[PDB]
Every structure is written in structure tokens, then in C-alpha cells.
Short mmCIF file of C-alpha atoms in Angstrom, two decimals:
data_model
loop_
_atom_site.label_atom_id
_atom_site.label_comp_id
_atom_site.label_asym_id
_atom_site.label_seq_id
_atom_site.Cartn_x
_atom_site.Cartn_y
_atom_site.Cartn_z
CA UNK A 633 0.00 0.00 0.00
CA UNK A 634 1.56 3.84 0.14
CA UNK A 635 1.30 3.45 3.56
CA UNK A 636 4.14 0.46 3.13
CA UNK A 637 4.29 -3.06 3.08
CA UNK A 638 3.82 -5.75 5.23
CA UNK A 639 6.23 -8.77 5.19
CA UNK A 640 4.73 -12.34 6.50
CA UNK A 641 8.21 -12.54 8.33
CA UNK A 642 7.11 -16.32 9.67
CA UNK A 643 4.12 -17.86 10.26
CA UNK A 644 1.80 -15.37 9.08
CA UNK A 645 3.08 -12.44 11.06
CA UNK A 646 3.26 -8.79 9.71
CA UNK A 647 6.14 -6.61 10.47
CA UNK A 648 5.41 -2.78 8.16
CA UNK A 649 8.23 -1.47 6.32
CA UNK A 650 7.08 2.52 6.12
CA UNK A 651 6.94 3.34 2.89
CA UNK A 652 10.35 5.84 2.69
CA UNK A 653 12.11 2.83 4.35
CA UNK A 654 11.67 0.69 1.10
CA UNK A 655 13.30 1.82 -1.42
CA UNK A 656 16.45 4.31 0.11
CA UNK A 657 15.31 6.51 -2.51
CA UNK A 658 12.41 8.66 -4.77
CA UNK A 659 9.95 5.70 -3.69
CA UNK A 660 7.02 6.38 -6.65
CA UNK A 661 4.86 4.64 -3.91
CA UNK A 662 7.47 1.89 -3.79
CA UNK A 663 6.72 0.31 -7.51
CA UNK A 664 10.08 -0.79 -7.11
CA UNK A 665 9.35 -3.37 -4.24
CA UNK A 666 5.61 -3.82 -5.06
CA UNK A 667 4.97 -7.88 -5.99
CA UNK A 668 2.63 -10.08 -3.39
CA UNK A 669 4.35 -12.82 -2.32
CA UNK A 670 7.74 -11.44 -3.40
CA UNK A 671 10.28 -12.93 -0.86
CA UNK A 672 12.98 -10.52 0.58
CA UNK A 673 14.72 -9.67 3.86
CA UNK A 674 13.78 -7.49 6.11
CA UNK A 675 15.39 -6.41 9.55
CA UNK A 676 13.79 -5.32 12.69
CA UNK A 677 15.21 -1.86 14.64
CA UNK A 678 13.38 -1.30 17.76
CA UNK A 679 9.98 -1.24 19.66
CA UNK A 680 7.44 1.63 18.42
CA UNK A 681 4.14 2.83 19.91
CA UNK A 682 1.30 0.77 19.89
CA UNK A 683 3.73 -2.19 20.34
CA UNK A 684 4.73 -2.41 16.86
CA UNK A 685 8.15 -3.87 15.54
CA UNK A 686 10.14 -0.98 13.15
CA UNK A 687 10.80 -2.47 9.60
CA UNK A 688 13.16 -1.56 6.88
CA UNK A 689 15.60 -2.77 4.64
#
């Protein structure tokens, strides 16, 4: 979404990479790294508010 995606990091569970945190650069709402079920790493930082994981690659 331009909100970001969400990796399935194992067993269903989604972890968002923000969508300027895709790409490193001029994102076009990531059309770069847009497929569904495109596999590719992605590394957690830190906690967040609301309990959520941070994403990025």
C-alpha cells in the first residue's frame, strides 16, 4: 500500500516497512518493491508505539 508493506516474516506475522524505508530513494509509492508474495529480507530496529516492531531494509 503507500502506507508500506507488510512482510509475512514467519508464520503469518506482519512486520510494516514505512513506505520511505523501502526503497532508500524517490519511492514512486514503492513500484520498485511492489509484488505479493515477493520474498525478501527485512530487519527489525526497535519497539514503536502501539507495540509495533520498526521495519526496513
Amino acid at each position: 500500500v503507500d502506507f508500506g508493506a507488510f512482510v509475512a516474516i514467519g508464520g503469518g506475522k506482519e512486520g510494516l516497512v514505512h513506505i520511505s524505508q523501502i526503497a532508500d530513494k524517490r519511492v514512486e509509492k514503492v513500484t520498485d518493491y511492489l509484488q505479493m508474495g515477493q520474498e525478501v529480507p527485512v530487519k527489525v530496529l526497535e519497539v514503536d508505539r502501539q507495540g509495533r516492531i520498526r521495519l526496513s531494509i
